[PDB]
Design a protein around this ligand. Structure first.
Ligand SMILES: *[C@@H]1O[C@H](CO)[C@@H](O[C@@H]2O[C@H](CO)[C@@H](O)[C@H](O)[C@H]2NC(C)=O)[C@H](O)[C@H]1NC(C)=O
Ligand SMILES: *[C@@H]1O[C@H](CO)[C@@H](O[C@@H]2O[C@H](CO)[C@@H](O)[C@H](O)[C@H]2NC(C)=O)[C@H](O)[C@H]1NC(C)=O
Ligand SMILES: N[C@H](CNS(=O)(=O)c1cc(F)cc(F)c1)c1ccccc1
Ligand SMILES: *[C@@H]1O[C@H](CO)[C@@H](O)[C@H](O)[C@H]1NC(C)=O
Ligand SMILES: [K+]
Ligand SMILES: [K+]
Length: 498
């Protein structure tokens, strides 16, 4: 429909430039003809989700790499893909002109964009906030009569969420996570630093905190927003650390176990919001499987926990098989969900690297890894940031798929945007991961899924410099002869006749 307008900022690839009169966009989605496949390609050299079609062929000869679809080897069903409506994201989006705001939101949420269907919503302030507040700052208010949503919610986040939902054809799911409680519920009396809820699970402090989640859901429901899930705490491990720089609330896994079993589980189940799912952990994967063992081996906690939320700090190395793999083996009926991912957080790297193909490849490699380890969804962090990677009240700046430049009423779509969209656009909710078997050792990363309507999608990432010829075999349908160029990502789509 409208192609990328590329701009280089001296990094390895280009951004796509959007403004009040122009943004790259797709035509309304259509599937290729039976017997044809669609291929969307992005490359370091500058191609951005460009479409080409090819024939599905009856026959294949050769000793080149073959990836054979295993349509009957079924794994997890996918919840979806999206990102976080932080205060910083909201401020950045709303600092654009109305036309550019609309083109940014369409980029993420419409079928002319990449079809996000998840939005994560902080419960009050976090580091990606310019004001520190909770919804109940008036002290000793244990019945929460003074609980209320400030303008950060009612003027900024809620209206943008309504606008996202209007632009989406896919149903959008909301996920809520708190960073800190009111300080008068905390041992240290501050939003940050080392501190936990006062007292012990089952008591007034813990019951008040549980009731705050219900007040929050009630307040958003008055604004005609309902939540798919909440997490028990954003990064509960952080509040155990001396000097933790921003909003946190410390839980050991035992503390979270007991809080869920005695307070949060019962409180949510007793509310009009009982259909909201509760996700535990909401933290980095090296805490698994230990955290899952501690919480889910207690049947009184386990009965309230729908899933395990994991964060991906893509700047840092950690094992996947020993964390996600082992957790799935021990608790196969408790879904894994990636609730936050970010890059650019190392102080010594530029927070925002406009046009970094490497950071794009980190996103897609992470997503593939997540999907191959049974994770049902993937949620980016801030939907949009400024060129500094903020605002952020502790200067904890990071990168984002969309960077807003208010002085030019412009925004830039990063390689990360397109790497995420290779998945989000083409993997509807309810899609199921299926097997994909390589005939020989190779340097490609790939994942296959089946849509609810039976159609196939395969994403292929090449992080190498070498162009790799390959063939995809769908045993029911035939062969897709293709190529995976060096530093490329491809999504393949086709209809399946039986
Ligand atoms: C928004 O960006 C577009 C795309 O770069 C600008 O339109 C271009 O303007 C230059 C200079 O006049 C022309 O050479 C291009 O042909 C234009 N491209 C298109 C696709 O129209 C546009 O001026 C910018 N809008 C605002 C309000 O700044
Ligand atoms: C379970 O839910 C009910 C709501 O149906 C709660 O009952 C309310 O409690 C408040 C005081 O806390 C009263 O002012 C309301 O009039 C009550 N409403 C109803 C309909 O009874 C009850 O407190 C909840 N119990 C929990 C969370 O343990
Ligand atoms: N062909 C393999 C990758 N195989 S895979 O696609 O099943 C995969 C498995 C993961 F656990 C994570 C991924 F992201 C991808 C390779 C690629 C690149 C260098 C060495 C080996
Ligand atoms: C495919 O292979 C079979 C068996 O040799 C052959 O009869 C057929 O013509 C080949 N070509 C096509 C296009 O089906
Ligand atoms: K208040
Ligand atoms: K940085």
């Amino acid at each position: 429909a409208r192609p990328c307008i590329p701009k280089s900022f001296g990094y390895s690839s280009v951004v796509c430039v959007c403004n009040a009169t122009y943004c790259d966009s797709f035509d309304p989605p259509t599937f290729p003809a039976l017997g044809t496949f669609s291929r969307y390609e992005s490359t370091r050299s500058g191609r951005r989700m460009e479409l080409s079609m090819g024939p599905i062929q009856a026959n294949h000869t050769g000793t080149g790499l073959l990836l054979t679809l295993q349509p009957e080897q079924k794994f997890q069903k996918v919840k979806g893909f999206g990102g976080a409506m932080t205060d910083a994201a909201a401020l950045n989006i709303l600092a654009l002109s109305p036309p550019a705001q609309n083109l940014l939101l369409k980029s993420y949420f419409s079928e002319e964009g990449i079809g996000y269907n998840i939005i994560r919503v902080p419960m009050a302030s976090c580091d990606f906030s310019i004001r520190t507040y909770t919804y109940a700052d008036t002290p000793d208010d244990f019945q929460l009569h003074n609980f209320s949503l400030p303008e950060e919610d009612t003027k900024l986040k809620i209206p943008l969420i309504h606008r996202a939902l209007q632009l989406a054809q896919r149903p959008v799911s909301l996920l809520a996570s708190p960073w800190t409680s009111p300080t008068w519920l905390k041992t240290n009396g501050a939003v940050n630093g080392k501190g936990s809820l006062k007292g012990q699970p089952g008591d007034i402090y813990h019951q008040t905190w549980a009731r705050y989640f219900v007040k929050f859901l009630d307040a958003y429901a008055e604004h005609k927003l309902q939540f798919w899930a909440v997490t028990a705490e954003n990064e509960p491990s952080a509040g155990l650390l001396s000097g933790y720089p921003f909003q946190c609330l410390g839980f050991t896994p035992e503390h979270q176990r007991d809080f869920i079993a005695r307070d949060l589980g019962p409180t949510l189940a007793n509310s009009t919001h009982h259909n909201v799912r509760l996700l535990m952990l909401d933290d980095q994967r090296l805490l698994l499987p230990h955290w899952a063992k501690v919480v889910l081996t207690d049947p009184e906690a386990a009965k309230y926990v729908h899933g395990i939320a994991v964060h991906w700090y893509l700047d840092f190395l950690a094992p996947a098989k020993a964390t996600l793999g082992e957790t799935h083996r021990l608790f196969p009926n408790t879904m894994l969900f990636a609730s936050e991912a970010c890059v650019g957080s190392k102080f010594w790297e530029q927070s925002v690297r406009l046009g970094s193909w490497d950071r794009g490849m980190q996103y897609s490699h992470s997503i593939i890894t997540n999907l191959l380890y049974h994770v049902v969804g993937w949620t980016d962090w801030n939907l949009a940031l400024n060129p500094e990677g903020g605002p952020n009240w502790v200067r904890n700046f990071v990168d984002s798929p969309i960077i807003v430049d208010i002085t030019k009423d412009t925004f830039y779509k990063q390689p990360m945007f397109y790497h995420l969209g290779h998945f989000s656009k083409f993997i509807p909710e309810g899609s199921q991961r299926v097997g994909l078997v390589a005939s020989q050792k190779n340097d490609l990363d790939a994942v296959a899924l089946m849509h609810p309507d039976g159609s196939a999608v395969v994403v292929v990432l090449n992080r190498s410099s070498k162009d790799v010829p390959l063939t995809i075999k769908d045993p029911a349908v035939g062969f897709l002869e293709t190529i995976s160029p060096g530093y490329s990502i491809h999504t393949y789509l086709w209809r399946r006749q039986h």
